[PDB]
Amino acid sequence: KVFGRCELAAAMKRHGLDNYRGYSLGNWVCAAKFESNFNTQATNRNTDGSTDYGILQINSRWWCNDGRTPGSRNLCNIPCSALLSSDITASVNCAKKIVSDGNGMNAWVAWRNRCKGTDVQAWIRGCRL
């Protein structure tokens, strides 16, 4: 599923990401846009061999198990395939452990380089929550 921007925004608030650890909703939506283009099915290989899964591009290295990632942790205790669902619950649930870790939303490279310190409010403008 490729979500609409406002539709993902709604789904994300429902799942309690709005101002989750201080990260306003526009940040999560901004991260999603550049990570996956709002596409739940999106997969990208990393240079280290690992794979990023889903609308928030969660990494097989540490967070999910895809069967083919070296010595790889499965810290959200889920198969990476779960993260490609049209239902975003597992992605969201996993993103909360990630962001609660230590480095906050910097664990998403695309957020650090493209969203951080920008007007992320614009990402939820005109969206009925």
Residues forming the annotated binding site for substrate?
Answer: 101
Report the alpha-carbon distance of residue 43 to residue 24 in Å, rounded.
Answer: 25
Reference 41, options 51, 31, 27; nearest CA is 51
**C-beta nearest to Cl ion: residue:** 104
Query: Active site includes 48?
Result: no
The dihedral region occupied by 69, where left means phi > 0, alpha psi between -120 and 50, and beta the remainder, is beta
Q: Which is nearer to Cl ion, 71 or 102 (CB)?
A: 102
Q: How far is the CB of 111 from Cl ion (least distance, A)?
A: 11
DSSP string, 37-57: TTBTT-EEE-TTS-EEETTTT
Q: How far is the CB of 31 from Cl ion (least distance, A)?
A: 13
Query: Active site includes 35?
Result: yes
Q: Of residues 35, 48, 66, 119, which has the active-site annotation? A: 35
Summarize as ranges the residues that interact with Cl ion (CB under 5 A): 104
Annotated binding site: which residue ranges? 101
Q: Which is nearer to Cl ion, 79 or 104 (CB)?
A: 104
User: Which residue's structure tokens are 């996993």?
Assistant: 94
Q: Of residues 18, 52, 66, 119, which has the active-site annotation? A: 52
Q: How far is the CB of 103 from Cl ion (least distance, A)?
A: 8
Q: Which is nearer to Cl ion, 117 or 126 (CB)?
A: 117
User: Which residue's structure tokens are 């619950």?
Assistant: 89
The residues that are catalytic are 35, 52
